[PDB]
Write a protein that binds this ligand. Sequence first.
Ligand SMILES: *[C@@H]1O[C@H](CO)[C@@H](O[C@@H]2O[C@H](CO)[C@@H](O)[C@H](O)[C@H]2NC(C)=O)[C@H](O)[C@H]1NC(C)=O
Lengths: 244, 194, 212, 223
Amino acid sequence: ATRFASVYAWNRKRISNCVADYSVLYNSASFSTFKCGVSPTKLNDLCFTNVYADSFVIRGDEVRQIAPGQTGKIADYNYKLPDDFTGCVIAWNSNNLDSKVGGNYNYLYRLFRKSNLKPFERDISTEIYQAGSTPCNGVEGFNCYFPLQSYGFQPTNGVGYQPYRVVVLSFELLHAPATVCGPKKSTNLVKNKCVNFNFNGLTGTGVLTESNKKFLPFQQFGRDIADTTDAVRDPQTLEILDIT
Amino acid sequence: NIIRGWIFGTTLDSKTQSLLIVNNATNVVIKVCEFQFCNDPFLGVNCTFEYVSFKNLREFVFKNIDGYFKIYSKHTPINLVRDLPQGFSALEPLVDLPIGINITRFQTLLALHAAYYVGYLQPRTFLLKYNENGTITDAVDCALDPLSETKCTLKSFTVEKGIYQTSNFRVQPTESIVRFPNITNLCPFGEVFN
Amino acid sequence: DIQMTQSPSSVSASVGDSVTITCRASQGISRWLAWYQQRPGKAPKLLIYAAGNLETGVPSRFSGSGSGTDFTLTISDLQAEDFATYYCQQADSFPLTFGGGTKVDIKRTVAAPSVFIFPPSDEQLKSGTASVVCLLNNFYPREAKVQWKVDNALQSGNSQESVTEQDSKDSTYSLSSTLTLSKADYEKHKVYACEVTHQGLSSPVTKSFNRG
Amino acid sequence: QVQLVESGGGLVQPGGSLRLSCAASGFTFSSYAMSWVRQAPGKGLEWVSAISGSGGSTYYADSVKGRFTISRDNSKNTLYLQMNSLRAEDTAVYYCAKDHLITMVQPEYFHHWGQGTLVTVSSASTKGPSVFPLAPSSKSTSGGTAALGCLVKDYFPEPVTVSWNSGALTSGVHTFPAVLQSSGLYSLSSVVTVPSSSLGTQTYICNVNHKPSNTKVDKRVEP
Ligand SMILES: *[C@@H]1O[C@H](CO)[C@@H](O[C@@H]2O[C@H](CO)[C@@H](O)[C@H](O)[C@H]2NC(C)=O)[C@H](O)[C@H]1NC(C)=O
């Protein structure tokens, strides 16, 4: 994405009903930090209800704050994760991108708030924080500070203060069809030889030969009198094969 | 082409996700958004899913199983003005939506400047005849009549002369009843409480 | 501090071709840039932002490239509506600075300028001001560089130029060079002339007239 | 997607002051940074002033600083730009620009553009145009076609309209864009090419109409 939203206004995107190859991102070696209760190593073989992507930009030193059971201004007032967080956290330097000559002050953070943020909560309130007992009257001043403080992102800032883009992927697993899995690799085809086959999860062993049986467009398998599988239709090419 | 749409749900007033199917011109629109439905929904002449692209009898079957909305259908040419034509034709699946919306009520959607029929389903046992090409050509309901039960038992559409055994006749326990001798030796709680 | 140069100033090309516009900032501006288009009589509209990110409504044939200092706007397919003025601005250092501006025209054959003379009228004589007009018609391209001579002497700071836009029937141009002076000064001299050197002309064309 | 409307421009005396206004609708005013950018009539764009989603930070161009003031109000959902010591170089079309992304301290890009209002500074007053003839030629030997026309001079303010016989002879007409004179007035040339055979035969009149001065004048040309 060209520009991210601020950390106090972290951008959430919903992903569902698609195929995600987590291996590609995992085999990218382009991010500074990549943490996952989920095992990163080849678990694009699992299905989930949804994938929620929370993206923002923070200084490098604050990057550590995005983890379960973490404290800090980002964790307390900008972006809070549940202690039972499921998913991964990814971060990579954006000093080449979010830094700017003269100071990049678009990205802000919430330093002042009445209370800490709940898990997965976003607070964009522009109400002046009332530090003391005097009402703020809609204007910042003594005992009344603007809740949003502006980062100065520059190419010369320290790495800990340098901008880092952070994206958090949360997997949803509820009582639902769970339509995002993301695996499904296939192989070639072999005929006229005793082999072990797996067609769309249907397993078996035998010899696959070309057939002349005329299936219906919506039907995939053929059965005999004894309920044994007899013919199949190749998912990658719509043709009928006899099993012996 | 007067019938054009369907609405399914439980409240159907934008308070919860109500499935909506609409046809317009050359386009089919399917959504699960919480649309604010009209009191008299028709067309003049939070979302989680969305898809966009008498002479005729069109049959449809709608059901829900394990969060999947299953839709079967069948089109056919007809020439009849009075009532439902009498005949047999199987229906093949077209749509399997992985949605998971609890649905209890529904309604149709018409276009105003075309009779239709409705029926409900039951858990029955059936016998089906697959032809050479794999098309269901005829069926038999088991629990319709004694002859039908006999056919279901023998797994045949032709029954030879004779006597067969089908089921077991029973009778029912009309009501419950309990007898215990009497109330005696009441524990004297009055002496303490009074 | 961040003054940027946009090239080429003005270009001409046919429908279906490709146009390349190169913008260079004085300092490295990372990816803080914006490429705009603007037709006469309308507000400018953004074509590219960041470095090569396209606008939603702009057709896909417009592309942006480059980074830091050099940047390039490429139009892969030219259309009749692609002839406008293009600009580049920076969005990283305040104050925000625009480019020189690039105008795109239609490529056509080079045509010789038809040059005509207009001495001040007798009605203009009573006013006390003399306006001598040299008219160029049906010339291409835009570059004409008209000059005035009085008694074979160069005149500077006394002439005003007004040029019509590119024509719609043959995509040509017209130019008016007016030499305005006082009646007393106009009466000092006897002969006036206007000269034009055009790429459609092998030799410069000078046209002269005498008062009376 | 949003609506931005600019107003307040006009014609004022040199050294005067003006107050332009930008009305913004369709989005929350406080979360976006406004900008005022002037474009000269014969020049390109150049940024002038910018405000930052509140009013705490005011940014000004190096040629407008010390005279102009930018302010914004969320309550009326609008922007104000006060211009002081207006000079002849302030005559330009002012545009109220906004960026698609929610920017609060800096404008950066300018994806939203308003209609813009013309601000003209001059010492001239309302006056009618003066029309003069420009004879076609005195030699029907060059190519058989001559160029004639009329000259409009010393009119203020813009514009003038030339009909050329009420639009009955439009073939070769060339009306050059209006140009500013050195005395605050303007000039125009309307030239047409006619065959040299039909010079003294066909009758032609150049008609010039001025609405601010309400002057409709007909002038004839004779070689
Ligand atoms: C699945 O993807 C394969 C890969 O392209 C598709 O196979 C192509 O099918 C078309 C027509 O059916 C042929 O013209 C191509 O030569 C095939 N390419 C290859 C590499 O096999 C296939 O159609 C897709 N769909 C299904 C259902 O298998």
